[PDB]
Every structure is written in C-alpha cells, then in structure tokens.
Amino acid sequence: STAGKVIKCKAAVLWEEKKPFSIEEVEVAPPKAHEVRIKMVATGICRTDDHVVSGTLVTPLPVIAGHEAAGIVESIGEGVTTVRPGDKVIPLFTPQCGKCRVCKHPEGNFCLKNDLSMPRGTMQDGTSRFTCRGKPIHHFLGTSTFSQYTVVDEISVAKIDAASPLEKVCLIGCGFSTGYGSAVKVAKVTQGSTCAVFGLGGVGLSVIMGCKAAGAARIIGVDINKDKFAKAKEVGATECVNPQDYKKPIQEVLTEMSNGGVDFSFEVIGRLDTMVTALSCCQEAYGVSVIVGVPPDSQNLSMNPMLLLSGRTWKGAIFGGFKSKDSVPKLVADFMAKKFALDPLITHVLPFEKINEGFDLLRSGESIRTILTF
Amino acid sequence: STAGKVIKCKAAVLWEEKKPFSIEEVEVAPPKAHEVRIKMVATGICRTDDHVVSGTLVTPLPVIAGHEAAGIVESIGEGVTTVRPGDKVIPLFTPQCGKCRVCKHPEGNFCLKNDLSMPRGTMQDGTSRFTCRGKPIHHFLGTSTFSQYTVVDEISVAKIDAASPLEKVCLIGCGFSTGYGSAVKVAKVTQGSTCAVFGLGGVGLSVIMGCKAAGAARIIGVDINKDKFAKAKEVGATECVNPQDYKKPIQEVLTEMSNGGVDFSFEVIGRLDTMVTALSCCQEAYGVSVIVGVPPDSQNLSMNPMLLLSGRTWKGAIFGGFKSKDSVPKLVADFMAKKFALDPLITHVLPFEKINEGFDLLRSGESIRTILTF
Numbered sequence: 001s002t003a004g005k006v007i008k009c010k011a012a013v014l015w016e017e018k019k020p021f022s023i024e025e026v027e028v029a030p031p032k033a034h035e036v037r038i039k040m041v042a043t044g045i046c047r048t049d050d051h052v053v054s055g056t057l058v059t060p061l062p063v064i065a066g067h068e069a070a071g072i073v074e075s076i077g078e079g080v081t082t083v084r085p086g087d088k089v090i091p092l093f094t095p096q097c098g099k100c101r102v103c104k105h106p107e108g109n110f111c112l113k114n115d116l117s118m119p120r121g122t123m124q125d126g127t128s129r130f131t132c133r134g135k136p137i138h139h140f141l142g143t144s145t146f147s148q149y150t151v152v153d154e155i156s157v158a159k160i161d162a163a164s165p166l167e168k169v170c171l172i173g174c175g176f177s178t179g180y181g182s183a184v185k186v187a188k189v190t191q192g193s194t195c196a197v198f199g200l201g202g203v204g205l206s207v208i209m210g211c212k213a214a215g216a217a218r219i220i221g222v223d224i225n226k227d228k229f230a231k232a233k234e235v236g237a238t239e240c241v242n243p244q245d246y247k248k249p250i251q252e253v254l255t256e257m258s259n260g261g262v263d264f265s266f267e268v269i270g271r272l273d274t275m276v277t278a279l280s281c282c283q284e285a286y287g288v289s290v291i292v293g294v295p296p297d298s299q300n301l302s303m304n305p306m307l308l309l310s311g312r313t314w315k316g317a318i319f320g321g322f323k324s325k326d327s328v329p330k331l332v333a334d335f336m337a338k339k340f341a342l343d344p345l346i347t348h349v350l351p352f353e354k355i356n357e358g359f360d361l362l363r364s365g366e367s368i369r370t371i372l373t374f
Numbered sequence: 375s376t377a378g379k380v381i382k383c384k385a386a387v388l389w390e391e392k393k394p395f396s397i398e399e400v401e402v403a404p405p406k407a408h409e410v411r412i413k414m415v416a417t418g419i420c421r422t423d424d425h426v427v428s429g430t431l432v433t434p435l436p437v438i439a440g441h442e443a444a445g446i447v448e449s450i451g452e453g454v455t456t457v458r459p460g461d462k463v464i465p466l467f468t469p470q471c472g473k474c475r476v477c478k479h480p481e482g483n484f485c486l487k488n489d490l491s492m493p494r495g496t497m498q499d500g501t502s503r504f505t506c507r508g509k510p511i512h513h514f515l516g517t518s519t520f521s522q523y524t525v526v527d528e529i530s531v532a533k534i535d536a537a538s539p540l541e542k543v544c545l546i547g548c549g550f551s552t553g554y555g556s557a558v559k560v561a562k563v564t565q566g567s568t569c570a571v572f573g574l575g576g577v578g579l580s581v582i583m584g585c586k587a588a589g590a591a592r593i594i595g596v597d598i599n600k601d602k603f604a605k606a607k608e609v610g611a612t613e614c615v616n617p618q619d620y621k622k623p624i625q626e627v628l629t630e631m632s633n634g635g636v637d638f639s640f641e642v643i644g645r646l647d648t649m650v651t652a653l654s655c656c657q658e659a660y661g662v663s664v665i666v667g668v669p670p671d672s673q674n675l676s677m678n679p680m681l682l683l684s685g686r687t688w689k690g691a692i693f694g695g696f697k698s699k700d701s702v703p704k705l706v707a708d709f710m711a712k713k714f715a716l717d718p719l720i721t722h723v724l725p726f727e728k729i730n731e732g733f734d735l736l737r738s739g740e741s742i743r744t745i746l747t748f
C-alpha cells in the first residue's frame with residue numbers, strides 16, 4: 001500500500017543552524033536500487049546531532065538529522081540482499097561496503113563510503129530522497145532517522161534480531177557501541193588498569209561500561225557537571241572528579257591520583273583542550289589515550305610532541321572501532337544475552353513530536369539519552 | 375692500577391651552545407656505590423649530541439655529551455653485581471632500574487630514573503663525577519661517553535659479549551637499536567605492509583632495516599637529501615622521494631603512491647611539520663605513525679584531531695621501545711649471529727681528537743655515523 005510510492009510523513013527538518021527543528025510534512029521517495037526504506041520505531045538524541053545545529057559539525061543544510069535509530073523495513077529496492085521487508089534493522093552511520101581497502105582490513109572500520117570526511121549530505125548516488133515544501137532536504141551520515149520514514153543505502157543498514165526491544169537496542173547504532181567499543185576494541189583495556197574518562201554522557205558512560213567489562217581496577221570519570229557522577233559510579237566509575245573543583249590543571253591531579261598517570265584515558269567531550277589534557281594524564285611511557293569526541297569544525301589543537309616521544313599512544317576512533325554491519329547485529333544479539341545493559345543510558349523517553357524538548361534537555365545537562373518512540 | 379683513584383683523560387667538554395667541543399683534561403672520580411667507571415673504546419656521533427650543541431635539546435651546560443658507545447670497565451664500586459672490572463659494556467642512555475612501574479610494565483621502557491624529562495645532568499645521586507678545570511662538569515643522559523673514561527650508574531650500563539667488535543656495536547647503544555625497534559617493536563610492522571620513513575640518517579636507515587626484517591612489501595624513503603637514497607635502497611627501501619621533489623604536499627604524494635595511505639609511517643627527523651605530515655600520510659582508518667625524531671625543545675605542533683578520530687594511531691618511543699639493560703646484550707648477540715648488519719651505518723671513522731671534524735661531517739649531510747676511536 002506504500003511500496004514504490006511517495007510516502008508523505010512527518011520529519012524533523014533543520015533549515016539553518018542554531019534553530020529548533022521544524023516538525024512538518026516531508027515527501028519520502030521510494031527506495032531505488034540497493035536502497036532500503038525504513039519505518040522508524042525509535043531514535044536517540046545524540047550530541048552529534050546537536051553539533052549539526054550548533055555549527056560544531058558542518059554538513060549541508062537543510063537536513064533531516066538523526067543517526068541513532070532502529071526501525072522496520074517498509075520496502076527494499078532492486079538488488080538488496082541483506083534485509084527484507086518487515087525485518088528489524090538499524091541505520092549504520094558508518095557504512096560497510098565490504099569491497100574497499102578499509103573494509104577488507106581486519107582491523108579497520110571507517111569505510112570509505114562514509115559522508116563524514118567531506119559531507120555530501122545525500123545518498124550514495126548523490127541525490128536526496130527527501131522533499132519538504134518542494135525543496136530537497138539533505139541527508140545526514142547516510143541515515144537521517146529524524147523522520148518517520150527514511151531511505152538508506154544497503155551498506156548503511158544492518159539486520160538485527162526479530163525479537164529485539166527496538167526502544168533500547170537503538171543505542172547500539174551509536175552511543176553505546178561507540179563508548180563500549182572505544183574501551184574494549186580501540187583502547188584494549190587490560191585487567192587491573194586505571195582508566196580516565198573525560199565526559200560522562202551516553203558515550204562516556206558506555207566507555208565506563210567497557211572498562212569495567214574489560215576488568216579495569218580504577219575508572220576515574222571527569223565532568224564539569226557533578227550531576228553526572230551518580231550514573232557514572234552506577235555503571236562502573238570508582239571515582240569522579242570535577243576540573244572546576246581543582247586549583248591546578250586537571251591532568252596534574254589525575255597524575256597524582258593514578259600515582260604517575262592512567263593506563264587508558266578517553267576524551268569523550270569534543271574539546272581541543274580536553275583532548276590534549278586527556279592525552280597528558282595517561283602514563284607517559286605506556287599510556288594510551290583515545291579521542292572519541294567530535295572537535296569544532298576546521299580547528300586545531302596545539303600539543304607538545306614530546307608527550308608522545310616518551311612512549312604514549314594516541315589514537316581516535318569512529319563508532320568504537322566496530323565494523324558496523326558485522327558488529328551491530330552481534331551487539332544486538334549480545335545485549336539480549338544479558339552481556340551488558342542499555343537501560344542505564346535511557347533517562348527520558350518522549351514522543352517524536354516533542355523532539356525539541358529532548359534536545360533542550362541535553363543542552364541543560366539533565367539527560368543522558370532521550371529515546372524518541374514513533 | 376687506577377682503581378679507586380682520580381683519573382686524568384681527554385674529554386670533549388661543551389662549554390656553551392653552538393660551540394665546538396673543547397678537548398681538555400678532566401678529573402674522572404672513582405666509582406661510588408653501584409657506579410661503574412668505564413674506559414671508552416668507540417663512540418658514535420648521534421644527531422642527539424648535535425641537538426645539545428645547537429640548543430635543540432636543552433641539557434645542563436657545561437656537559438660531556440655522548441651516549442652511543444661501547445667500552446671496557448675500568449672499575450666497579452661497592453654493591454655492583456652485573457659487570458666485573460674489564461667487561462665489555464655499553465652505556466644505556468635509557469636506564470633500566472627494574473623497580474619502577476615503567477621498567478616493570480610489559481611494554482614500557484622510558485624508565486622513570488631517566489634524565490630526559492627533567493635533565494639535571496648528574497648521576498642517580500645528584501652529583502657529578504667529572505671535574506674539569508676546578509669545575510664540576512655535568513653528565514649527559516647518565517652516559518657522557520665523549521670521554522676516554524666515564525662513570526655511569528650500574529642501571530645505565532649493560533654487559534655485552536666479550537668477543538664483540540666495540541667499534542661496531544656502539545651503534546646498538548642508540549642509532550641502530552632505536553630505529554630498528556621503533557619498526558619491529560613500537561610500530562610492530564606487518565608482513566607485506568607499506569612503510570614510509572621520513573629521514574634517512576643513521577636512525578632512519580635502521581627503521582628501514584627493521585621494516586625489511588618485519589616483512590614490509592613497500593618501504594618508501596623520504597629525505598630532502600637525494601645523496602641519502604643510495605644507502606636507503608641498499609638496506610631495503612623500495613622507493614625514495616624528495617619532498618622538494620613534489621609540488622603537492624608530500625603527504626598527498628605518498629597517499630597517491632600508497633593508494634590511500636601507508637600502513638606505517640615514521641618521523642625520523644625531528645621537525646614539527648614532518649611529524650604531522652608523517653601522520654597525515656598513513657591510512658586515516660588504520661594507519662600507524664611513530665615519532666622517533668627529537669623535536670625542538672619546549673616547541674609545540676598544530677595538528678587536526680580529525681586525523682585521529684577516523685582511526686589513526688599516533689605514538690612515539692625512546693630507544694625503539696627496547697628495555698635497555700635487557701635488550702642491549704640480546705641485540706649484540708644477534709649481530710654476532712649475523713642477524714643484522716651495522717656496517718651500512720658506518721660511513722666514517724675518526725679518532726677521538728677529530729670529534730669536531732666528525733660533527734661537521736654530520737652537519738654537512740655527508741655522513742651517516744662517524745665512529746670515534748679512543
């Protein structure tokens with residue numbers, strides 16, 4: 001009754017930066033070859049989406065944002081083989097073509113078909129399946145799940161379990177997987193180590209879960225909002241410190257607390273200063289610091305290279321280093337096997353119509369993850 | 375005959391920066407508790423010693439420099455248990471106390487008892503064994519090998535094989551073992567990967583030897599001195615580029631050549647610009663870049679954190695990551711077993727009196743290592 005036809009539905013359009021989302025009707029074109037149309041079930045409010053509003057992350061406007069979601073396939077285009085109509089799926093904001101130099105690498109994950117390095121804000125064929133008021137609406141990261149119906153390329157969606165709580169497992173599309181994978185797959189947190197986590201939101205808490213799951217003896221969470229310490233200690237943080245509660249540079253404090261530096265530090269905020277700070281506080285000869293936060297656009301940090309020369313390892317990662325299409329189904333299947341918990345990340349659950357409310361909440365500090373259930 | 379006595383010998387004292395070494399007689403005190411007085415046989419001229427002269431590496435002046443050496447123990451002091459009088463040893467500019475948390479970690483090697491981070495230019499007890507002209511003379515990295523006799527702390531020296539050619543294995547004391555281990559231990563280069571090496575001096579060529587021994591498929595040598603290309607090809611470099619031999623950024627050129635970026639890149643120069651360039655030229659999703667060169671002192675680089683978020687791993691290392699007191703006897707035993715060659719590194723041989731002429735060979739570019747004989 002809808003396959004092969006234009007679907008008229010509501011979406012959250014962003015016409016310009018630093019303005020709230022306009023909840024209006026959009027025209028969703030039917031899926032083309034190797035494309036998939038998804039009926040959204042639940043979507044998360046990631047800071048990454050807020051970065052598009054604030055101008056921190058630059059992508060073509062106007063746009064339908066969102067990338068943390070899980071829906072059910074409405075219709076598939078010609079040549080789609082990995083998902084069928086009626087399958088539960090998760091949009092992958094990092095694709096997995098399987099044919100490129102990174103996808104074939106056994107330990108690489110930033111597939112080259114991504115729309116992040118140089119945002120084109122379209123499908124793979126370079127066109128927009130979205131229309132609002134007759135104007136075409138750009139895509140976001142190949143997902144654009146801030147809509148009741150979206151279209152993704154087959155490389156940007158994975159099939160998850162048919163018996164999946166779609167209102168929880170949507171966090172596996174981004175927030176949880178990024179933080180958990182950064183700790184387990186990127187940093188490679190060892191048993192008994194000391195970990196520092198800068199930022200205690202959805203991704204930062206997920207990092208903490210990964211470190212505790214990896215057996216970290218100490219997990220020091222850092223945030224300038226102490227209202228976040230409670231949740232952090234719930235999921236594994238052994239101590240929480242507030243840089244504003246220190247007279248000297250936070251890194252010096254953590255060097256003391258760790259008796260010479262932490263084994264693994266994580267920047268999970270998106271500031272240049274914290275990125276260098278988080279690298280500074282890990283052990284100068286065998287420490288590892290992982291950047292997870294998104295920096296401001298086109299904008300450099302200044303850092304003493306002699307901080308690496310002593311033996312430090314500094315690395316970043318997209319989506320926790322997880323190969324998206326291989327891993328997102330494995331994580332959904334692990335979550336239901338009670339391998340880890342997603343519920344500690346969900347603080348608010350709202351109607352999609354109240355999407356500017358869940359965003360106002362993230363900018364005031366009151367939320368970790370606001371799920372939007374369609 | 376001289377045990378427990380003050381010894382007069384020639385030494386190259388550096389009085390002020392950017393000045394020639396002054397061959398003067400100096401009073402070498404006898405060894406103290408856990409100290410070893412060593413007679414020098416051969417010492418190499420490292421670019422690090424020139425950093426002291428130029429001011430690139432700030433260390434207390436006046437100083438007796440030198441850290442590449444091999445010699446024979448004059449005498450030991452009370453409580454020394456690892457080296458007897460007259461054993462062939464190598465001073466370790468990176469000590470291995472074996473009791474801090476670095477020495478003791480499975481991969482760390484920048485022992486906290488080092489004199490690099492906060493150089494005081496003394497022994498472990500804070501005093502100088504060098505008297506020249508009624509003045510205490512600073513040490514250098516607890517080695518000060520630019521002297522017919524020196525006194526090193528027991529944790530800064532390693533007994534090596536008694537049949538060792540000391541005019542060759544002094545390079546295991548720094549130049550070779552640094553570049554070699556940076557490739558096989560630090561970067562941990564893979565079978566059949568593509569390697570880029572910025573800098574084709576003594577340390578840069580050793581990286582090539584490590585890269586080749588690790589099974590590299592392509593080893594791209596980068597140097598602005600085309601006269602360095604012959605020796606680089608001779609030790610395993612498949613190609614050689616002059617950055618001044620391209621119109622694009624050198625990192626664009628290497629990215630084309632590598633079809634998307636190299637697997638492993640090495641900065642073996644000591645320039646801020648080439649550190650970032652060497653990091654840019656490896657694969658954004660799984661490239662590894664190792665800094666080996668010494669940057670200008672307290673001088674700061676500017677790089678884009680988006681280079682790391684995509685996946686890139688950025689690290690540095692001292693002495694190729696080798697635990698010094700452990701590795702120097704093994705590495706001298708592998709040279710005995712013909713498992714690598716030091717002869718391609720030795721381009722010049724001069725007497726100790728010709729130290730100033732040996733430095734000008736390096737400053738002129740005409741040399742790899744000049745080996746001073748005592």
Ligand SMILES: NC(=O)C1=CN([C@@H]2O[C@H](COP(=O)(O)OP(=O)(O)OC[C@H]3O[C@@H](n4cnc5c(N)ncnc54)[C@H](O)[C@@H]3O)[C@@H](O)[C@H]2O)C=CC1
Nearest residue numbers: 047048178199200201202203223224269270293294318319
């Ligand atoms: N590389 C990747 O794959 C992904 C990157 N990210 C980025 O990670 C970062 C964190 O994501 P979220 O948890 O969703 O954002 P968030 O706003 O929920 O959490 C950030 C936390 O850091 C705190 N903070 C802000 N400024 C601080 C400062 N100067 N010092 C200490 N703490 C400070 C905030 O109070 C907040 O609690 C974002 O920048 C996001 O764009 C998010 C998803 C995946």
Ligand SMILES: NC(=O)C1=CN([C@@H]2O[C@H](COP(=O)(O)OP(=O)(O)OC[C@H]3O[C@@H](n4cnc5c(N)ncnc54)[C@H](O)[C@@H]3O)[C@@H](O)[C@H]2O)C=CC1
Nearest residue numbers: 421422552573574575576577597598643644667668692693
């Ligand atoms: N991290 C560690 O453990 C150690 C660090 N080092 C440092 O490694 C660096 C190299 O050591 P050496 O081989 O002995 O010095 P070197 O002078 O023999 O080699 C440096 C090479 O870099 C080349 N070069 C200079 N500018 C260049 C540019 N813009 N682009 C491309 N190539 C350029 C030079 O032509 C030269 O051939 C030094 O800075 C040294 O202090 C030395 C030993 C141990």
Ligand SMILES: O=CNC1CCCCC1
Nearest residue numbers: 420422441467548668692
């Ligand atoms: O060359 C020998 N040692 C070097 C190691 C890198 C920092 C400066 C000193």
Ligand SMILES: [Co+2]
Nearest residue numbers: 046048174175
């Ligand atoms: Co996100």
Ligand SMILES: [Co+2]
Nearest residue numbers: 420422548549
């Ligand atoms: Co050296």
Ligand SMILES: [Zn+2]
Nearest residue numbers: 097100103111
């Ligand atoms: Zn791919």
Ligand SMILES: [Zn+2]
Nearest residue numbers: 471474477485
């Ligand atoms: Zn030690």
